[PDB]
Amino acid sequence: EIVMTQSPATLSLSPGERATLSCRASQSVSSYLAWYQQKPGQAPRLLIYDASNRATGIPARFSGSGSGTDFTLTISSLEPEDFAVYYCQQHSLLPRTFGGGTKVEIKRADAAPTVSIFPPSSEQLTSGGASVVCFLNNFYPKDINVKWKIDGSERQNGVLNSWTDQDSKDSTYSMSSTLTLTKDEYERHNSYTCEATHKTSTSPIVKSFNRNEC
Amino acid sequence: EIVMTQSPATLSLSPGERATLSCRASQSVSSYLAWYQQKPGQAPRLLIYDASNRATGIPARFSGSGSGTDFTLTISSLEPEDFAVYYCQQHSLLPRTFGGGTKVEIKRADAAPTVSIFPPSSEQLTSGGASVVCFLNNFYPKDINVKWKIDGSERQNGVLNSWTDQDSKDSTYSMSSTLTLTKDEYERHNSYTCEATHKTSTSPIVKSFNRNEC
Amino acid sequence: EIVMTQSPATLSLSPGERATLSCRASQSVSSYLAWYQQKPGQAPRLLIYDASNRATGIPARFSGSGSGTDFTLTISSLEPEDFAVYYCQQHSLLPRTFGGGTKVEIKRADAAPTVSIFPPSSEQLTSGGASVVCFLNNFYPKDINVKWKIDGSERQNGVLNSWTDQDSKDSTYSMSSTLTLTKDEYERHNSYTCEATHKTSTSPIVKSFNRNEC
Amino acid sequence: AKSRTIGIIGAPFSKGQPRGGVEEGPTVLRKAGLLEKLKEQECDVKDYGDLPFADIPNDSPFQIVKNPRSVGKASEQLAGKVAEVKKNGRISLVLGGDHSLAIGSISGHARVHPDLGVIWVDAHTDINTPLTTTSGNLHGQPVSFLLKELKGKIPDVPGFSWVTPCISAKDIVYIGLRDVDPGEHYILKTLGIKYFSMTEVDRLGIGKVMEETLSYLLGRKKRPIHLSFDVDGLDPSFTPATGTPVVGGLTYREGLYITEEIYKTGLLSGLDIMEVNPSLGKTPEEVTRTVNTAVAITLACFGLAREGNHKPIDYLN
Amino acid sequence: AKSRTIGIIGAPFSKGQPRGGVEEGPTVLRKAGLLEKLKEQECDVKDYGDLPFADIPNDSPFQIVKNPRSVGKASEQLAGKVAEVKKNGRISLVLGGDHSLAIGSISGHARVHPDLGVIWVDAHTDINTPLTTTSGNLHGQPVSFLLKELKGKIPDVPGFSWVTPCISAKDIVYIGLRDVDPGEHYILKTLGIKYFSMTEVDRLGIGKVMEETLSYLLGRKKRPIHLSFDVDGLDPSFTPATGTPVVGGLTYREGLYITEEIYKTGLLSGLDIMEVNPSLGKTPEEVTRTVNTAVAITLACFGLAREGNHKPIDYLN
Amino acid sequence: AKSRTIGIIGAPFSKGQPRGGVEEGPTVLRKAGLLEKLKEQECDVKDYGDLPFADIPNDSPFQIVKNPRSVGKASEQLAGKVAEVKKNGRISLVLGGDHSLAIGSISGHARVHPDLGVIWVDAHTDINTPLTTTSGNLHGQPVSFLLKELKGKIPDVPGFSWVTPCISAKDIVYIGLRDVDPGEHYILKTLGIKYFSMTEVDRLGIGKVMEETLSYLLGRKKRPIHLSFDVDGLDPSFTPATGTPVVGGLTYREGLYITEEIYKTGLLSGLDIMEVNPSLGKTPEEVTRTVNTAVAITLACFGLAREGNHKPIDYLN
């Protein structure tokens, strides 16, 4: 049992220069560990087999080093098809731990989210439910805290969030704030606020609507 | 591990003709399974040892067949002493599962329950409790849903039911609806309803009483 | 697995005569068990190794007997440095259970607790908490039940107690009644009672204070 | 070559022994890759498939012998298939199953070679008759239908009308006996069958036992050897997933030595691997040890010596 | 018969060895049915019951020897009972317990047969004296009270005033030595006792070892054999539930071979089964393997050969 | 004495074999107290410490042979240290590690004694060349750099420019072969190396095997014996925590007998304990059995007979 730690937890580097990564071992794995290229929704493709030597079908640019505690993975010719989570794997000690994840993002000028909210349908009120979802579209980077409030008094334990992968063209992100309430708790209150907070937003953007307003 | 399934979950056949049962295996047990006669409160008496051959003290009528996936148990001369739960047991694969249960009931013209309710005693109010039990006596078949209500608003998580075995003479069933409330929740409300529902009852029979009515 | 039972659960004997203890086995350990002297906050020092024979550095007075089910430990010359919890250990059967604990206290004329209460600080009200602790100091013996009340209606699940070891000089005990409430539940009520009960107290001593009284 | 020219015959049959589960005999021995582990060394392996064993519904037992007709029909079908694969000049590797199949597996072998010798490696003698049995299981009675000297002490068991006794009492050798009935030991001492029980194996050692065995069968005249190998004859620390395990058995070393000395005669002409029961291992690791043991026994029957084997070309090139 | 005429003597005694729990020695060996497993073959089994061993309260130890008086009184009571069951012409099956009982179990046997020979199957020599011991446990000193040549190197241990040294140094054979003290090995090489340690057992094999053992004891004159069998002398893979297990022991095959060759002399006249400790198995399966091993050793002492046994009537009827 | 004058050389090296974890070879064998268990009997134990093995960063492999420069530098450093401890007149106890170190551990031994004989106790022959390998691991190729007859069939592997072939084909004995490559078996039959595979060990018994081994090496002329002992050559029931275990191995009894017969020649002059891997035991109990087995093998190499040992003074005082 050896914990394998990766020092860049996330990474955002524009298509261009080197993007050297890190994988630190808790013991001396001693030039016996590997590297991977798990794209989202794919099988983890092998990059490097034992700390170097560029395993069998890698294009030109994924050399690494090691021997034997803190290893590197150099992406010298970044090539924007390579935007995937990278994993380091020790192998010559059991059990066989992996790294943590090295999500190489895309690096652009920080985009503001389009903070937009929607009431539940009247069809859902005929079912007995109330799902209030605030959609935040086209933002960069990821980090947004969204606060729901009962007419100004904050909401917990009903909020669900769905983050996207980074988009291919504008390199932004999208997010729902899925808040589900009952039919009774819907009809008790009116002003349903979506307090969004992004780094581009100097003030916390609060998007709201009253019940039966539209 | 082989799940043994019995196709008649329950059975109700009057003293008379054949009552052929079913035991389906999930593999090929191949003429290596058994049959049993667990009377209520008794030890499971052996009927058939390996798919036939009438094991050593069976009267005249409990032949079966098989070989090797879906087996039968014929009760050709029904004989109303035989009203007991029957179990099939595979043996030549481990672990040794049994069947599910084949509760051969008595088959009569469907009886109406005498839906009767009783308040808790005043002795119980001097203890701090309130047990409201609605007794349903002499019904056939078993299936009755009983609904308790807080003066018309339904009750949950305090209702206990005690079903009898089928009676020897009239072949009916009996059932308590044991509802236990506190002393405080007793004194809050008056009309304590027993909404009973039997197949003989075209309308749901509601038996009720007010608090301190009798 | 043999449960080893000690018949004096507690013990209080003044510096003086014999203080013979008990260790009953559930089988025949047959002269193969031991004795210990765990002082509070110390390592359990060995008294007797196999039912007798005074193991290697014991002063003059810790002889015992046995062979083979219910054993004794004689403290003939009591010597008030010996006020510690004593443990008997069976050894020649696995697993190796110990006794229960034989807390030899100090035996004086029973002291009354100084039942004293304190409000939470106003500093704690600026934090959002309310810790109401009733200190009971210099009592003997240990047994005191302390009741907290919401202006006369009893309190549960917030009461913590911290008992001391018996003091060296006056041979008494001390106890906090650590009751922690919120800032809101503090401001709802005023009279915060400490219903203490000691054997010297013929009446249950209730120490109280109003909110913002002092 | 003359040896290691294998015709595999599966036989998933269980109605001789009570512990149901040896029907996955050929299935587990093939899914552990017995064919592929034979095909490295020069083995002309031809799989003849598992046999279709029908289910006779009115399988009325004998007095104590139970399921007689199913075992008789199964062994007749197996003896036909073994005679078929021995007319092709192969070595009849039969693998079941249970020892009840060995009636047909030796009778069909004796339809082609009437002068064979059986090395019956088993914990038990399996020489019970339908009159002297206590269990009545037909995995304990294959030998007593085969011996010529027991003609007359065998009742006409239904389904066994075809069985002609094919071997004599002085042409069979037991290796590994450690659980013998009183009736079995009385038959074994009356007929004078040369047996090497675990007393003699502990005394002489497996080298002297195999030397005396091959001198007893092949010393007078070179003749086909039919190793009928049981997996409870080995010690249950090595094969726990068998039907009737008896502790204190042949070690895995000694079993491999028996099969290697049978191979180095070059006169092996039929192999039986019976009583493998993968449904009785308390862990899957126990099943894995049992099946790897039986596969290693078969591979050492067909040429895999523990000292190593090389193809006859120069490797320093 | 002359042999297999057993008088069982239980002896639930533990105060020689430290690991308490061998008091369930006869209880577990009887509840595994040693009596009923003897009574199939022609064994006139007469249970003489467990002995009542008193608890001496002031059991003051010696210098290093601990609990001396309890062991001395227990062995005197056992020697009286063994002399009683050998005046009845039986075979004194004693089963404990621990090796500290073997003082009485050989002395009471020598009160009837003064010319016996002891086959001491043990992992250890148990030949420590009260002067050369390190543990001081009396399960490691039964032999040195019995040898005639060690008269004078034994202090007057309390409770052992009755012990007369009964056997000589050339009338005892060790089989299975693999954990010997320096004092024990010095005594064993000074007295010249014929010992078969695990080096000689690995060299010669258990056949040659038992042949040389029976030629050493019974070659000059036929005399009673007193097999004093320990269950740690077998390998701890077979008997893990013993007091002092030492790895690399006699296999279960070799132990059964020793007892079968002792039986086939027909001169067995006393059996000791010591150091069975059912409270030390890490699983109940370990206790089950230990007790089944010791029961199988006793049954193979009293006639159950692994090749099989039959009553002398015709079975083909 | 002349023997049991030990110079321990640790060698925590792993870059020959794939299963990383044998770097805790000397660490676990020393923390089990090999030094202290040697120091009871008269052993002038001098710990020469673990060797510092550098990490060559650009360790570019050969065609199939992988990590060549690290193994070559490690064996050169080890051969220097072994020549140092053999100029002090000791017995070069080397303990690793893996068999890739045995190149240096025999070469440095042959720098002092040019006429040594290697008893290579291993499950494998380890006689693969860089041309005939399939794994390419250098724990499978130490012998083929050492044999004088294989000069010319060995390419100039980088890091092995210093290796002079030091022993001949008729001066090495294999004991325990049960997993041999086709290339390995072809080399073993071409050179005519006297090997005792598990077929011959099951046939002759370990007494006859060790007698023929010592007669093959020491029968013509008394010469230093270099026991290079592997812990997968023993059966994996005794050492499961090794690199490449192969079932059906030498029992713990037979391994102790081999080492005792090597000691009783008095000509042991170097011991190698390789392939101990404490990170592969499925339980810590498996690691405990492996390390206690290897420690007992080393202690029986240096005088601890199973029959017992005593210092030459009177103990009855």
Side-chain angles (χ1 to χ4, degrees), chain D residues 206-207 252-254 257 260-261 264 306-311 313-317, chain F residues 132 153 177-178 180 182-183 185-186 195 197-203 248-249 254:
Chain D
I206 200 65
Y252 175 75
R253 292 169 59 188
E254 289 174 351
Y257 182 75
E260 284 175 351
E261 293 293 327
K264 288 192 286 186
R306 289 176 292 175
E307 66 184 2
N309 295 112
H310 70 282
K311 298 180 177 66
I313 59 169
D314 192 2
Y315 285 159
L316 295 176
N317 291 319
Chain F
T132 59
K153 298 293 183 181
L177 302 180
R178 60 190 182 275
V180 180
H185 185 267
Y186 179 73
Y195 64 97
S197 65
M198 298 302 291
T199 300
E200 289 85 3
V201 176
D202 286 328
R203 180 182 298 114
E254 289 174 351

Short mmCIF file of all heavy atoms in Angstrom, two decimals, chain D residues 206-207 252-254 257 260-261 264 306-311 313-317, chain F residues 132 153 177-178 180 182-183 185-186 195 197-203 248-249 254:
data_model
loop_
_atom_site.label_atom_id
_atom_site.label_comp_id
_atom_site.label_asym_id
_atom_site.label_seq_id
_atom_site.Cartn_x
_atom_site.Cartn_y
_atom_site.Cartn_z
N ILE D 206 7.79 -44.09 -3.55
CA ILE D 206 7.06 -44.12 -4.81
C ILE D 206 7.95 -44.56 -5.97
O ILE D 206 7.44 -45.04 -6.99
CB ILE D 206 6.40 -42.75 -5.05
CG1 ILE D 206 5.26 -42.86 -6.06
CG2 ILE D 206 7.42 -41.72 -5.50
CD1 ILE D 206 4.12 -43.68 -5.55
N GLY D 207 9.27 -44.47 -5.81
CA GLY D 207 10.17 -44.98 -6.83
C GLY D 207 10.13 -46.49 -6.91
O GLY D 207 9.98 -47.07 -7.99
N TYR D 252 1.41 -34.59 -4.28
CA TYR D 252 1.42 -34.11 -5.66
C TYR D 252 2.71 -34.47 -6.38
O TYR D 252 2.69 -34.76 -7.58
CB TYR D 252 1.19 -32.61 -5.63
CG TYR D 252 1.28 -31.87 -6.93
CD1 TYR D 252 0.27 -31.93 -7.87
CD2 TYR D 252 2.36 -31.05 -7.18
CE1 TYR D 252 0.36 -31.21 -9.05
CE2 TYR D 252 2.46 -30.33 -8.33
CZ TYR D 252 1.47 -30.42 -9.27
OH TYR D 252 1.61 -29.68 -10.42
N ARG D 253 3.83 -34.46 -5.65
CA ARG D 253 5.10 -34.95 -6.17
C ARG D 253 5.00 -36.41 -6.58
O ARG D 253 5.43 -36.79 -7.67
CB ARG D 253 6.17 -34.80 -5.10
CG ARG D 253 6.55 -33.38 -4.78
CD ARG D 253 7.41 -33.37 -3.54
NE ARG D 253 8.62 -34.16 -3.71
CZ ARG D 253 9.47 -34.44 -2.72
NH1 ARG D 253 9.22 -34.00 -1.50
NH2 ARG D 253 10.55 -35.17 -2.96
N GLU D 254 4.41 -37.24 -5.72
CA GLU D 254 4.34 -38.67 -5.99
C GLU D 254 3.37 -38.99 -7.11
O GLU D 254 3.61 -39.92 -7.89
CB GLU D 254 3.97 -39.42 -4.71
CG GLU D 254 5.08 -39.44 -3.68
CD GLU D 254 4.66 -40.05 -2.36
OE1 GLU D 254 3.45 -40.30 -2.18
OE2 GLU D 254 5.53 -40.27 -1.49
N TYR D 257 5.16 -38.25 -10.22
CA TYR D 257 6.17 -39.27 -10.48
C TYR D 257 5.54 -40.53 -11.06
O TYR D 257 6.15 -41.17 -11.93
CB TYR D 257 6.93 -39.62 -9.20
CG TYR D 257 8.00 -40.64 -9.45
CD1 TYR D 257 9.18 -40.29 -10.08
CD2 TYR D 257 7.82 -41.96 -9.08
CE1 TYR D 257 10.15 -41.22 -10.32
CE2 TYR D 257 8.78 -42.90 -9.33
CZ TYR D 257 9.95 -42.52 -9.94
OH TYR D 257 10.91 -43.47 -10.18
N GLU D 260 4.80 -39.72 -14.71
CA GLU D 260 6.02 -39.64 -15.51
C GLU D 260 6.61 -41.02 -15.78
O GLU D 260 7.09 -41.28 -16.88
CB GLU D 260 7.06 -38.76 -14.82
CG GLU D 260 6.79 -37.27 -14.92
CD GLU D 260 7.78 -36.46 -14.12
OE1 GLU D 260 8.56 -37.07 -13.37
OE2 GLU D 260 7.79 -35.22 -14.24
N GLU D 261 6.57 -41.91 -14.79
CA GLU D 261 7.07 -43.25 -15.03
C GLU D 261 6.15 -44.07 -15.93
O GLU D 261 6.62 -44.99 -16.60
CB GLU D 261 7.29 -43.99 -13.72
CG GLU D 261 8.40 -43.41 -12.89
CD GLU D 261 9.76 -43.56 -13.52
OE1 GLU D 261 9.99 -44.57 -14.21
OE2 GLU D 261 10.61 -42.67 -13.31
N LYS D 264 7.23 -42.76 -19.45
CA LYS D 264 8.54 -43.19 -19.94
C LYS D 264 8.59 -44.66 -20.33
O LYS D 264 9.60 -45.10 -20.88
CB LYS D 264 9.63 -42.88 -18.92
CG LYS D 264 9.95 -41.40 -18.81
CD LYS D 264 11.21 -41.15 -18.02
CE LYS D 264 10.99 -41.35 -16.54
NZ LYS D 264 12.20 -40.96 -15.77
N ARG D 306 8.96 -33.10 -15.24
CA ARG D 306 9.33 -31.96 -14.41
C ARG D 306 10.76 -31.52 -14.64
O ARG D 306 11.11 -30.39 -14.28
CB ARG D 306 9.12 -32.30 -12.94
CG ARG D 306 7.66 -32.39 -12.56
CD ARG D 306 7.49 -32.81 -11.12
NE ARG D 306 7.91 -34.19 -10.93
CZ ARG D 306 7.96 -34.79 -9.75
NH1 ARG D 306 7.60 -34.13 -8.66
NH2 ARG D 306 8.36 -36.05 -9.66
N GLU D 307 11.60 -32.37 -15.24
CA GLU D 307 12.96 -31.95 -15.54
C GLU D 307 13.03 -31.05 -16.76
O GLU D 307 14.05 -30.40 -16.97
CB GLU D 307 13.85 -33.18 -15.75
CG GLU D 307 13.48 -33.99 -16.97
CD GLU D 307 14.32 -35.24 -17.10
OE1 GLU D 307 15.17 -35.48 -16.21
OE2 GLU D 307 14.14 -35.98 -18.08
N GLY D 308 11.97 -30.99 -17.56
CA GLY D 308 11.95 -30.13 -18.73
C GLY D 308 11.92 -30.89 -20.04
O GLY D 308 12.37 -32.03 -20.11
N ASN D 309 11.39 -30.26 -21.08
CA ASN D 309 11.29 -30.88 -22.39
C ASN D 309 11.67 -29.86 -23.46
O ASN D 309 11.34 -28.68 -23.34
CB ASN D 309 9.88 -31.40 -22.65
CG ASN D 309 9.51 -32.53 -21.72
OD1 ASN D 309 8.65 -32.37 -20.86
ND2 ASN D 309 10.17 -33.67 -21.88
N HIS D 310 12.37 -30.33 -24.49
CA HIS D 310 12.79 -29.47 -25.59
C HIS D 310 12.47 -30.14 -26.91
O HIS D 310 12.52 -31.37 -27.03
CB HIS D 310 14.28 -29.15 -25.51
CG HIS D 310 15.16 -30.33 -25.80
ND1 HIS D 310 15.41 -31.32 -24.88
CD2 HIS D 310 15.85 -30.67 -26.91
CE1 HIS D 310 16.21 -32.22 -25.41
NE2 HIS D 310 16.50 -31.85 -26.64
N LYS D 311 12.12 -29.33 -27.90
CA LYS D 311 11.92 -29.85 -29.24
C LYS D 311 13.27 -30.15 -29.88
O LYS D 311 14.24 -29.42 -29.64
CB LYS D 311 11.15 -28.84 -30.10
CG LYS D 311 9.77 -28.53 -29.57
CD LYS D 311 9.05 -27.53 -30.45
CE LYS D 311 7.64 -27.28 -29.96
NZ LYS D 311 7.65 -26.61 -28.63
N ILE D 313 15.50 -29.51 -31.98
CA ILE D 313 16.26 -28.61 -32.82
C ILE D 313 17.22 -27.84 -31.93
O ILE D 313 17.06 -27.79 -30.70
CB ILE D 313 15.37 -27.62 -33.62
CG1 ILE D 313 14.53 -26.77 -32.67
CG2 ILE D 313 14.51 -28.35 -34.64
CD1 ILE D 313 13.82 -25.62 -33.35
N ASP D 314 18.24 -27.24 -32.54
CA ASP D 314 19.22 -26.47 -31.80
C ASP D 314 18.59 -25.15 -31.36
O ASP D 314 18.03 -24.42 -32.18
CB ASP D 314 20.46 -26.22 -32.65
CG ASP D 314 21.64 -25.68 -31.85
OD1 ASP D 314 21.53 -25.52 -30.61
OD2 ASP D 314 22.69 -25.41 -32.46
N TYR D 315 18.70 -24.84 -30.07
CA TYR D 315 18.17 -23.61 -29.50
C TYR D 315 19.20 -22.51 -29.38
O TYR D 315 18.83 -21.36 -29.14
CB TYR D 315 17.55 -23.89 -28.13
CG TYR D 315 16.22 -24.58 -28.20
CD1 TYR D 315 15.73 -25.28 -27.11
CD2 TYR D 315 15.45 -24.54 -29.35
CE1 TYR D 315 14.51 -25.91 -27.16
CE2 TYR D 315 14.22 -25.17 -29.41
CZ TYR D 315 13.77 -25.86 -28.31
OH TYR D 315 12.55 -26.49 -28.34
N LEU D 316 20.48 -22.82 -29.53
CA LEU D 316 21.54 -21.82 -29.43
C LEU D 316 21.82 -21.20 -30.80
O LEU D 316 22.93 -21.26 -31.33
CB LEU D 316 22.79 -22.43 -28.83
CG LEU D 316 22.65 -22.89 -27.38
CD1 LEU D 316 23.93 -23.57 -26.90
CD2 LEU D 316 22.30 -21.72 -26.48
N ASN D 317 20.79 -20.60 -31.38
CA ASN D 317 20.89 -19.97 -32.68
C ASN D 317 20.22 -18.60 -32.68
O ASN D 317 19.05 -18.48 -33.06
CB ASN D 317 20.27 -20.85 -33.76
CG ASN D 317 21.08 -22.10 -34.02
OD1 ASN D 317 22.30 -22.07 -34.06
ND2 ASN D 317 20.38 -23.22 -34.20
N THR F 132 18.29 -16.96 -25.57
CA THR F 132 17.27 -18.01 -25.46
C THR F 132 16.20 -17.69 -24.43
O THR F 132 15.33 -18.54 -24.19
CB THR F 132 17.92 -19.35 -25.11
OG1 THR F 132 18.63 -19.23 -23.88
CG2 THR F 132 18.87 -19.78 -26.21
N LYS F 153 28.37 -18.22 -26.60
CA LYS F 153 26.93 -18.15 -26.77
C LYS F 153 26.31 -17.04 -25.94
O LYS F 153 25.10 -17.03 -25.72
CB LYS F 153 26.28 -19.48 -26.41
CG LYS F 153 26.73 -20.62 -27.30
CD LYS F 153 26.25 -20.42 -28.72
CE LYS F 153 26.62 -21.60 -29.60
NZ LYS F 153 26.18 -21.40 -31.00
N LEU F 177 14.71 -29.12 -9.44
CA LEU F 177 14.20 -28.57 -10.69
C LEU F 177 12.79 -29.08 -10.95
O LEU F 177 12.56 -30.29 -10.98
CB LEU F 177 15.10 -28.97 -11.85
CG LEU F 177 16.54 -28.55 -11.74
CD1 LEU F 177 17.27 -29.04 -12.97
CD2 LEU F 177 16.64 -27.06 -11.60
N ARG F 178 11.84 -28.17 -11.13
CA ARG F 178 10.51 -28.58 -11.54
C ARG F 178 9.85 -27.61 -12.51
O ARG F 178 8.67 -27.78 -12.83
CB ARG F 178 9.63 -28.78 -10.32
CG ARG F 178 9.48 -27.55 -9.50
CD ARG F 178 8.81 -27.87 -8.20
NE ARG F 178 8.61 -26.68 -7.40
CZ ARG F 178 9.53 -26.17 -6.59
NH1 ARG F 178 10.71 -26.75 -6.47
NH2 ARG F 178 9.25 -25.08 -5.90
N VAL F 180 11.39 -25.89 -15.95
CA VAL F 180 12.56 -25.73 -16.80
C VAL F 180 12.08 -25.32 -18.18
O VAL F 180 11.12 -25.90 -18.71
CB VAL F 180 13.38 -27.03 -16.86
CG1 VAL F 180 14.60 -26.87 -17.73
CG2 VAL F 180 13.80 -27.45 -15.47
N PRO F 182 12.30 -24.89 -22.34
CA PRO F 182 12.87 -25.73 -23.40
C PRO F 182 14.30 -25.36 -23.75
O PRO F 182 15.12 -26.27 -23.99
CB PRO F 182 11.92 -25.50 -24.58
CG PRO F 182 10.63 -25.16 -23.94
CD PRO F 182 10.98 -24.35 -22.73
N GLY F 183 14.63 -24.07 -23.80
CA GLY F 183 16.01 -23.68 -24.00
C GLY F 183 16.89 -24.07 -22.83
O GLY F 183 18.03 -24.50 -23.01
N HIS F 185 16.32 -26.65 -20.77
CA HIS F 185 16.50 -28.10 -20.77
C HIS F 185 17.42 -28.54 -21.90
O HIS F 185 18.15 -29.53 -21.74
CB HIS F 185 15.16 -28.81 -20.88
CG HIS F 185 15.26 -30.29 -20.77
ND1 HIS F 185 15.36 -31.12 -21.87
CD2 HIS F 185 15.30 -31.11 -19.69
CE1 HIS F 185 15.43 -32.37 -21.47
NE2 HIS F 185 15.40 -32.39 -20.15
N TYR F 186 17.44 -27.81 -23.01
CA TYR F 186 18.37 -28.15 -24.08
C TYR F 186 19.80 -27.86 -23.69
O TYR F 186 20.71 -28.64 -23.99
CB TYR F 186 18.01 -27.41 -25.36
CG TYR F 186 18.96 -27.72 -26.49
CD1 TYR F 186 18.92 -28.96 -27.12
CD2 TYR F 186 19.90 -26.80 -26.91
CE1 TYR F 186 19.79 -29.26 -28.15
CE2 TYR F 186 20.77 -27.09 -27.94
CZ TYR F 186 20.71 -28.32 -28.55
OH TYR F 186 21.58 -28.61 -29.58
N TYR F 195 22.02 -32.89 -12.77
CA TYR F 195 20.87 -32.24 -12.17
C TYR F 195 20.00 -33.27 -11.47
O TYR F 195 19.86 -34.39 -11.96
CB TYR F 195 20.06 -31.47 -13.22
CG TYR F 195 19.41 -32.33 -14.28
CD1 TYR F 195 18.09 -32.73 -14.17
CD2 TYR F 195 20.12 -32.71 -15.41
CE1 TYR F 195 17.49 -33.50 -15.14
CE2 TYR F 195 19.53 -33.49 -16.39
CZ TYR F 195 18.22 -33.88 -16.25
OH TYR F 195 17.64 -34.65 -17.22
N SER F 197 16.37 -33.22 -10.61
CA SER F 197 15.03 -32.66 -10.67
C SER F 197 14.11 -33.42 -9.71
O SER F 197 14.50 -34.41 -9.09
CB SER F 197 14.49 -32.72 -12.09
OG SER F 197 14.33 -34.06 -12.51
N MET F 198 12.86 -32.96 -9.61
CA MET F 198 11.95 -33.53 -8.63
C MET F 198 11.51 -34.95 -8.99
O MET F 198 11.01 -35.67 -8.12
CB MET F 198 10.73 -32.64 -8.48
CG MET F 198 11.08 -31.27 -7.96
SD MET F 198 11.90 -31.34 -6.38
CE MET F 198 10.56 -31.89 -5.36
N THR F 199 11.71 -35.36 -10.25
CA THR F 199 11.55 -36.77 -10.60
C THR F 199 12.60 -37.62 -9.89
O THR F 199 12.27 -38.63 -9.26
CB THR F 199 11.66 -36.93 -12.11
OG1 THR F 199 10.62 -36.18 -12.74
CG2 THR F 199 11.52 -38.39 -12.49
N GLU F 200 13.86 -37.20 -9.95
CA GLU F 200 14.92 -37.96 -9.30
C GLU F 200 14.85 -37.84 -7.79
O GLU F 200 15.27 -38.76 -7.08
CB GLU F 200 16.30 -37.51 -9.79
CG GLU F 200 16.62 -37.92 -11.22
CD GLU F 200 16.10 -36.95 -12.24
OE1 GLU F 200 15.52 -35.91 -11.84
OE2 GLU F 200 16.27 -37.21 -13.45
N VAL F 201 14.33 -36.73 -7.27
CA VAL F 201 14.20 -36.58 -5.83
C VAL F 201 13.06 -37.45 -5.31
O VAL F 201 13.18 -38.07 -4.24
CB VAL F 201 14.02 -35.09 -5.46
CG1 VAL F 201 13.80 -34.91 -3.98
CG2 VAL F 201 15.25 -34.31 -5.88
N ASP F 202 11.97 -37.55 -6.07
CA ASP F 202 10.91 -38.48 -5.70
C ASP F 202 11.34 -39.93 -5.86
O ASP F 202 10.90 -40.79 -5.09
CB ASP F 202 9.66 -38.23 -6.54
CG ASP F 202 8.92 -36.98 -6.13
OD1 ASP F 202 8.95 -36.64 -4.93
OD2 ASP F 202 8.32 -36.33 -7.01
N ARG F 203 12.19 -40.22 -6.84
CA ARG F 203 12.65 -41.59 -7.04
C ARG F 203 13.62 -42.01 -5.95
O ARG F 203 13.34 -42.93 -5.17
CB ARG F 203 13.31 -41.73 -8.40
CG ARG F 203 13.81 -43.14 -8.67
CD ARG F 203 14.51 -43.24 -10.01
NE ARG F 203 13.61 -42.93 -11.11
CZ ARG F 203 13.75 -41.88 -11.91
NH1 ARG F 203 14.75 -41.03 -11.72
NH2 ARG F 203 12.88 -41.67 -12.89
N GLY F 248 4.61 -28.23 -5.83
CA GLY F 248 5.23 -29.54 -5.85
C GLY F 248 6.72 -29.51 -5.59
O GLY F 248 7.47 -30.19 -6.30
N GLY F 249 7.16 -28.76 -4.59
CA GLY F 249 8.57 -28.55 -4.35
C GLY F 249 9.11 -29.42 -3.23
O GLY F 249 8.46 -30.32 -2.72
N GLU F 254 13.09 -31.92 3.77
CA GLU F 254 14.12 -32.25 2.80
C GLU F 254 15.09 -31.10 2.60
O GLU F 254 16.28 -31.34 2.38
CB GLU F 254 13.47 -32.65 1.47
CG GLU F 254 12.77 -34.00 1.53
CD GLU F 254 12.00 -34.32 0.27
OE1 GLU F 254 11.85 -33.43 -0.59
OE2 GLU F 254 11.53 -35.47 0.13
#
